[PDB]
Structures are given as structure tokens and as C-alpha cells.
Symmetry: C2
Subunit: 152 residues, 2 copies
């Protein structure tokens, strides 16, 4: 049943039909050790391309550099954060990335992984702005379910 849990985890991770990745900060430049299918479709990249690399490639010319700063802080201060950022596909098509980052720790408090979940959403009206903040909760829910899965 030891290696069975490995097959199950793989499968439970593949069933999470949502945009996410997992990085290992221990490894050089905190690279991507797993990317979901949805994330691949959304960004138009293959695994061969993105595995072993840091996720900064999604950024581009009009990506707000100041929002990227907060992600450095969160990572270097090994803590979560949620932002909305301008990202690009492999070709170069823009999309608003309602992105959430958060760490995953062992019992010794050492950060083992960072779970990163992305959401897309095309004026900032009452229904439009409350929809954005509901999305930010959904990206969390997801991030937690990924955490719950990996642990259990």
C-alpha cells in the first residue's frame, strides 16, 4: 500500500481540473515540478517546455512589475499572497490572471512546495468587482484542496 498511495495521489492530482502548478523552492530557482492540464491549455505550453523552470515566463511587456514585487516578498518571506496580474500565452495573448500563491510545509516548518493556482476573467462595476473577489476565494478553495489532496 506504500507505492499505491503514489499512484492514487497522481490520479487525485490529475482529477483537479483547474489551473495550477507546484514548485519546489529547494531546487534551483524554485522550478515547476508539476503543471495541470488546464494550466497547460490556458497558457498554451507543453510540459517539456515548462518543467524545471520558474513561472516568470507568463509575464510580459505590460505585466505590472510592482505586482510581481509582492510575489517576491511572499516567496522570500515564505508566505501566501493573492494578486491579479496580466499574463500571456505561449503565442502572446493577454489574460487577467487572478493568481494565488501559498506554501506547503512539513511538520518541521520547512517549506516543501508552493502551490500556485490561476484563474481567468476576460469598467469595474458592483457585480463585476464582487465577482473578482469571489474568484479570489475560489483560487484559495482550490489551493487548499490541492494541499488537502497531497497531504491525505
Amino acid at each position: 500500500k506504500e507505492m499505491r498511495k503514489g499512484i492514487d495521489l497522481a490520479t487525485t492530482l490529475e482529477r483537479i481540473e483547474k489551473n495550477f502548478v507546484i514548485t519546489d523552492p529547494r531546487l534551483p530557482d524554485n522550478p515547476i515540478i508539476f503543471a495541470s492540464d488546464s494550466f497547460l491549455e490556458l497558457t498554451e505550453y507543453s510540459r517539456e517546455e515548462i518543467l524545471g523552470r520558474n513561472c516568470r515566463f507568463l509575464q510580459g511587456p505590460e505585466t505590472d512589475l510592482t505586482t510581481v514585487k509582492k510575489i517576491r516578498n511572499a516567496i522570500d518571506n515564505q508566505t501566501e499572497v493573492t494578486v491579479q496580474l496580466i499574463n500571456y500565452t505561449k503565442s502572446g495573448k493577454k489574460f487577467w490572471n487572478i493568481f494565488h500563491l501559498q506554501p506547503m510545509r512539513d511538520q518541521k516548518g520547512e517549506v516543501q512546495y508552493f502551490i500556485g493556482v490561476q484563474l481567468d476573467g476576460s469598467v469595474r462595476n458592483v457585480i463585476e468587482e464582487t465577482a473578482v473577489k469571489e474568484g479570489e476565494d475560489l483560487v484559495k478553495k482550490t489551493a487548499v484542496n490541492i494541499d488537502e489532496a497531497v497531504r491525505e
Copy 2:
């Protein structure tokens, strides 16, 4: 204690990535459970068969068979499974919508160090669209998967 589970959950993530990088049609089943149900199915297998993971996880792979599936060839699979030995046969199977195809299938048991069978690996290949040439590739894919699962 923690560390027994850290390497356990780390290798479930790596397995998920290595397995999915094979980019071939395959499933893994657990003979200890009733009906030797599917505990993993690759992305290409779904593309091929048209079913989704929820539609096939836990079920037996017999659902791929239909009207013109040669029961003698299916009998050879039974004997291979009962006698826990590999086999490579050519068989008519059907997608979810009902489309036929020649399934150049390869079964092989994933055995432990003591010799007993732990899982079964199944590799499919559409060969109707190079006869025994595909038999080698299907067997290669089996080993890829075998090694992937046992890696640790």
C-alpha cells in the same frame, strides 16, 4: 512519522509528471480489488477512447469491447491475467461514441522483488489507420510505466 509521508507524497507528484510525460495510451489496474479496476488512465487513453476519468476509474477495461471483438482473443487476455503473465494481442475495441479501432494491446504484470504481482499495466495503440513494429513500441511503453511506478 512525517518523513515517511513526505517522500511518499513527493513521489506521487513526480510520478504524476513522469507518467504523463510518456504521452501514450495506458491504464493501471489493481488485481487485489474486485474486477481488477482501473486506478490510473493516461491523458492519451482518454483522448483515444473518448471517456473521462470519472467515467472509467474503478471500472474494468472490458467496456472498450463490442460487437466485433473476437472473444477468443479476449479469452487469451483472461488466461494471461489468471496465469499472471504478459501477452500482446490485436483486438477490436470501441470508443464512447461507438467508433471501432484495432487495439494493439499489451498486458504485463508489474511484479514485486519477491515475484508476486502488484499491479497490471495495459498499453493500447490504434493500428488500423507496421504490424509487429507497434508490438515493440507498446512493450516499450509498458516498461516506461513499470520503471516510473517503481522509481522511488
